[PDB]
Every structure is written in C-alpha cells, then in structure tokens.
Amino acid sequence: KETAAAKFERQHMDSSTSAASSSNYCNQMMKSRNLTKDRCKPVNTFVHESLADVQAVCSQKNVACKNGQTNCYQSYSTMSITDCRETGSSKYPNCAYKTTQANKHIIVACEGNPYVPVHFDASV
Ligand SMILES: Nc1ncnc2c1ncn2[C@@H]1O[C@H](COP(=O)(O)OP(=O)(O)OP(=O)(O)OP(=O)(O)OP(=O)(O)OP(=O)(O)OP(=O)(O)O)[C@@H](O)[C@H]1O
C-alpha cells in the first residue's frame, strides 16, 4: 500500500529547477500524478527541490497547521514551487488548471518515524 509519505512525494515532489513541460504544466502534472482520477484535486503545489531539502523542513520552523494540529513546519529558505488551481470551467472528469509559478516558503505537516512530510499545508 502507498504510505502517507509516498503519497506526499507523488502529489508534491517535482525535483528540478522549476516547472518544465511540453504543454500546460498543471494539466499535464495533475493528470500524470493521478490527481484527476477520482476527482479534480482543486488546488495542488509541486515543489522543485531535492527530496532531502523538502524532508529537512520537518526540523525547520514549527507553526500551527490550518486544521489546528501543531505538526506543521515552514521552510527557512524560499523554495521554487508551482501552484495548480482548478479553473472555473473545470468539471470532472475534464479537469483543467491554471499554472502559477512562485518562489515561496512552504509549510508541510510531518508525521511518522522517520518524521517526514505527509501533507502540504500552505505556501507563504
Ligand atoms: N498533520 C496534518 N495536518 C493537517 N491536515 C492533515 C495532516 N495529516 C493529514 N492531513 C490531512 O490533509 C487532508 C486534507 O484535509 P483538509 O485540508 O483539512 O480538508 P479539505 O476540505 O481542505 O480537503 P480538500 O479536498 O479541499 O483539499 P486536499 O486536496 O488537500 O485534500 P487531500 O488531497 O485529500 O489531502 P492530502 O492527501 O493530505 O493532500 P495535500 O497534501 O493537502 O495536498 C485530510 O486528510 C487531513 O487529514
């Protein structure tokens, strides 16, 4: 079975310098990572950093999670990311996304042993 940690990698890791794609990055990535299979995932962030760099955030700045848990962590450095937001015309199963590239601090929730990211909470 896919662990929460593996799911975080499938949903959010895109190790590279920045978004690269032959067509609309978000439409191709949301499809290829199976984020459009059971619904159109409405918002999603891809992180263009090494897996070690993202995992290291779990020992960086402790912040409250949007859901009130306290196992969220904000990166000290800005990171290269791409946000995918479903369009107003998007309707499952014909999902469609707008692509926003950014350099922002990421906030992830971490869990488990080893303590690793399992949920992407926000970017600031
Ligand atoms: N330590 C944590 N702190 C906060 N939330 C956490 C933590 N661990 C797991 N979660 C889970 O996050 C899921 C979304 O919950 P909530 O956010 O509280 O409700 P929502 O109404 O907002 O859902 P939505 O559909 O609108 O937006 P999602 O697309 O994010 O949902 P889903 O993909 O299924 O979530 P994930 O797998 O984690 O992807 P991702 O890493 O977040 O991208 C939900 O299962 C929570 O239990």
Author numbering: 1 to 124
From the paper:
With the new chain-extended nucleoside oligophosphates in hand, we go on to investigate in detail their interaction with ribonuclease A, a model protein containing a polycationic active site and for which X-ray crystal structures are relatively straightforward to obtain. Thus, we go on to investigate in detail the interaction of the polyanionic constructs with ribonuclease A, a model protein containing a polycationic active site and for which X-ray crystal structures are relatively straightforward to obtain. This work presents a combined experimental and quantum chemical approach to understanding the interactions of RNase A with the new nucleoside hexa- and heptaphosphate constructs.
Here, we demonstrate by extending adenosine monophosphate (AMP) and uridine monophosphate (UMP) to their corresponding nucleoside hexaphosphates, while adenosine diphosphate (ADP) and uridine diphosphate (UDP) are phosphate chain-extended to the corresponding nucleoside heptaphosphates. In the presence of Mo(NCMe)3(CO)3,35 [PPN]2[TBA]1 readily reacted with anhydrous NMPs and NDPs, yielding the corresponding hexa- and heptaphosphates after subsequent hydrolysis. Anion-exchange HPLC purification of the resulting compounds provided the ammonium salts of adenosine/uridine hexaphosphates (50% yield for p6A and 29% for p6U) and adenosine/uridine heptaphosphates (24% yield for p7A and 17% for p7U). This result represents the first direct chemical syntheses of nucleoside-5′-hexa- and -heptaphosphates. Additionally, we found that the hydrolytic ring-opening process exhibits less selectivity when leading to the nucleoside heptaphosphates as compared with that leading to the nucleoside hexaphosphates, with observed formation of pentametaphosphate and NDPs. Aqueous solutions of the purified nucleoside hexa- and heptaphosphates were observed to be stable for at least a week, as confirmed by 31P{1H} NMR spectroscopy.
